[PDB]
Design a protein around this ligand. Structure first.
Ligand SMILES: O=P(O)(O)O[C@H]1[C@H](OP(=O)(O)O)[C@@H](OP(=O)(O)O)[C@H](OP(=O)(O)OP(=O)(O)O)[C@@H](OP(=O)(O)O)[C@H]1OP(=O)(O)O
Ligand SMILES: [Cl-]
Ligand SMILES: [Cl-]
Ligand SMILES: [F-]
Ligand SMILES: [Mg+2]
Ligand SMILES: [Mg+2]
Ligand SMILES: [Mg+2]
Length: 134
């Protein structure tokens, strides 16, 4: 079930999943509706679910990775689609081979240099590109 803040924005969480503590390469996943497009993995918080817990759950489900949770980067609103996403750094320590969204919907994942992740997110997902600004 979807959850909302008091202003009716959907509550989401996501991680910037980095290959190493250098934070130079990040894992993107394919769009569910548009396989040829890249997104930052993330999704809806469940009722009473801590944002850090939702973030780590969604990137397990969507990207098939686990790791060491880092700092909250910020909370990012998509005015058009009415959602607010808590975005965390995650340093990846496990890459799993047959993860929920690989099996269920054929979701892909790929490592991008930060500059290239910003480039592929800008057109359809400019707020996700902005996750990388700081
Ligand atoms: O409407 P669409 O363009 O098909 O977008 C979809 C909606 O996003 P949005 O329209 O709200 O921006 C949807 O969210 P809902 O609108 O609540 O269905 C959102 O799912 P999300 O990641 O928020 O949730 P979850 O991962 O928990 O399913 C979904 O993400 P996901 O299926 O998990 O990758 C978006 O699909 P996308 O992969 O970004 O192409
Ligand atoms: Cl890295
Ligand atoms: Cl967005
Ligand atoms: F989900
Ligand atoms: Mg999801
Ligand atoms: Mg999602
Ligand atoms: Mg979900």
């Amino acid at each position: 079930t979807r959850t909302y803040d008091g202003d009716g924005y959907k509550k989401r969480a996501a991680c910037l999943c980095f290959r190493s503590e250098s934070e130079e390469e990040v894992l993107l996943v394919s769009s569910s509706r548009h396989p040829d497009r890249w997104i930052v993995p993330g999704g809806g918080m469940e009722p009473e679910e801590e944002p850090s817990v939702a973030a780590v759950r969604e990137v397990c489900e969507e990207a098939g990775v686990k790791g060491t949770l880092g700092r909250l980067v910020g909370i990012f609103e998509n005015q058009e689609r009415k959602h607010r996403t808590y975005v965390y750094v995650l340093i990846v320590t496990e890459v799993l081979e047959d993860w929920e969204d690989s099996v269920n919907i054929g979701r892909k994942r790929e490592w991008f240099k930060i500059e290239d992740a910003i480039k592929v997110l800008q057109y359809h997902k400019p707020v996700q590109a902005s996750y990388f600004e700081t």
